[model samples]
Target: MQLNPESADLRALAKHLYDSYIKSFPLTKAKARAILTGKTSPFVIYDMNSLMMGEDKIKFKHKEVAIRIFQGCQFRSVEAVQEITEYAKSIPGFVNLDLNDQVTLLKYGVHEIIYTMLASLMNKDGVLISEGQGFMTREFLKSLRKPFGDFMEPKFEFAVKFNALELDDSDLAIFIAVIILSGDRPGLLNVKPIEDIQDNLLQALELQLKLNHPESSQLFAKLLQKMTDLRQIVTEHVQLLQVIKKTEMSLHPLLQEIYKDLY
Candidate 1:
């Protein structure tokens, strides 16, 4: 897994890009809280007993909390896409791609990138630290019923396994960059060039993984496999969104734009 001198240089460039740019834009729980509440503090827990009592005031309180949670998720999702776009532009030649190709990649790849970022929010117990203080437990999420609940489980499932891989920030930076540069999106016109860029990134990542996880020989392959897992999660996510759209839940305009034609 040792990189040749030339590959070493590429790895160095990748590491530099990661350190100089990607490292600065992590979608952390604290930041997510700040985006939702305008400050980084614990969220007030909605009273489940009051919600069950079905009083109008109590129900409105619970509904507002749910709206804030949804808004927070939307904010984080939009921020993740923007960060990926910035990272893509920072890569050596990504901006030179045909505009259509660039849009195709970002449109199709954003969810995978977001799910990859979700690894940061995951814990060993399969709970997500959502909205700073709201512990997104599997049971609690599932209890939210169709669409709203469905939105989270696929990510949680992916995050639990991805977190088990124990990739550090350097590994994640390269992997996420690779996810963004993938050339297999159906409408990509400049596939060969995009694939070439992806190949170079993979080589850089391979070398970094070898250097960083010398004792874990299979880590590279496992990380690649997570890309497949991510695709599946995105598919399920779209299906759930479709179900949600059929209900009374209104999709945010930004999310709707991001999800355009994703199904």
Candidate 2:
């Protein structure tokens, strides 16, 4: 699972993996459009019969809708993890990890990395979403009751700042790889090897950021700072979810599992 830093083949493979992984999700602008326009199926579609059950059906539908919303969010989160796992497999040393270590890294890293991806979905004022055919604003989100809306704002807050860095797809790819290969995660059996992989990825990311933004002297350092910020944002995210779960509202099982250790 060793990679030669000077080898052109390793460099090419890294670029290829980066390109493929970033393309798996919609671009920032398109993600906004897709959510607003209903292009990404952001809403849940319920069955007609269930909608016709009068008072009982109405109550059930309300519950179902809430579940659906969480489900939709969970689906996106799961898809991101799956795509990331695919990308990790493409990296030379990633697949060489013990199966337990691989799962441990994915479990600890997925939410942080997913939040990093969500940064791209931010606009000047808010992240995008829809109930029918329109977009949801930060103001509108705040108007909603506790927990549901509360969970979203912190992400948008982080995203607004993260997006300000203006790291393009190439920068994100290497940064994400670095996040995935991190050695600092809990339960990792092979810390040294994982750290080696992370170091190589960081060097690649630093070089890529420098080459891509020659005029920006501190871009690499700023990117590292963003990683720290990402950790903070995700910590807030886990706390928000904890608050929401404490309420009567049901949290999605997968999301519950994802945040299990965080609490």
Candidate 3:
């Protein structure tokens, strides 16, 4: 498809957004490559000795694998939160918001942003956790008992569809920003401000999608469905984590801190 001459500036702005996205999260390609080469950690394979023994041993302990995976995910989620905070500072207008709005946006948007980024670590079969050091098979998770097993299960379903959507890192960058800049978040101190920032992002994304899939005029509509689909998983996670918090399974202190409000 020919470049739409009328939307020339739209495409230029989209390119700039891509640059900002890459600056914020340069590891997007690094993780994807790690998954391909699969520098898979031995920790997930060892049972009691649990690969920490470090002699190339293998034993699958069905029990606690879910907790172990969840713990690893917790560490990464916290890292993501910090990274997202840093990324938000680069987004125009985000730092201009009232202090309360910044915190509130992070509070509401942190998990969803992290969840969207999680797609890079996954395929139809499994996901890479712990800085792409550990690979967890979908079947391994399914074989486990309740609560813990269910914890990661919802992600797999969402990731498969997300993988099918095939967003590039730049697209993901704006996608995540919109998730944060959303006006619908409760207690937003200034809804119109967020809307202004998000409207620019939405336009950039729509044009980027046009460039990515010039054949599909309706692709942006599909993007909305994916965004809505993501909201469902995050809510389910919020509820599931609520249940996990009550259980005896130990959670990372960082996750426990986040749960103090998220739950």
Per-model TM-score on C-alpha atoms = 0.80, 0.78, 0.83
Model 1 clash pairs are none
Model 3 reaches what TM-score against the true structure? 0.83
In model 2, the clashing pairs are none
Expressed as tens digits, the lDDT of each residue in 1-116 for candidate 3 is 34686477667666666677677764684457455466534234323343244223333222354565666567677778888888887777899999889988888788887777
- Cα displacement (angstroms), candidate 3, residue 56, comes to 8.1
Question: Which 10 residues in a row give candidate 2 its minimum summed lDDT?
Answer: 53-62
Best by TM-score: 3
TM-score of candidate 1 relative to the true fold = 0.80
Cα lDDT tens digits, model 1, 1-263, are: 44488876877876776774545475543454344444533223334543333233222312554555577677767766777787777776789999888988888888888888776666533343333444344555556644566677777777777877767777877887789898889778989999998888888888888888878999999999999989998888887777666755657686787677787
Displacement of the residue 72 alpha carbon in candidate 1, Å: 2.4
Judged by lDDT, which candidate is best?
A: 3
Q: How many steric clashes between backbone atoms does each model show?
A: 0, 0, 1
RMSD of each: 5.5, 6.5, 4.4
Ranking by TM-score: 3, 1, 2
Stretches of candidate 2 off by over 4 Å are 1-10, 26-68, 129-135
lDDT (0 to 1) per candidate: 0.70, 0.68, 0.71
lDDT of 2 by residue, 215-258 (tens): 79898888888888878888887777666666666565766776
Worst 10 residues of 1 by lDDT: 53-62
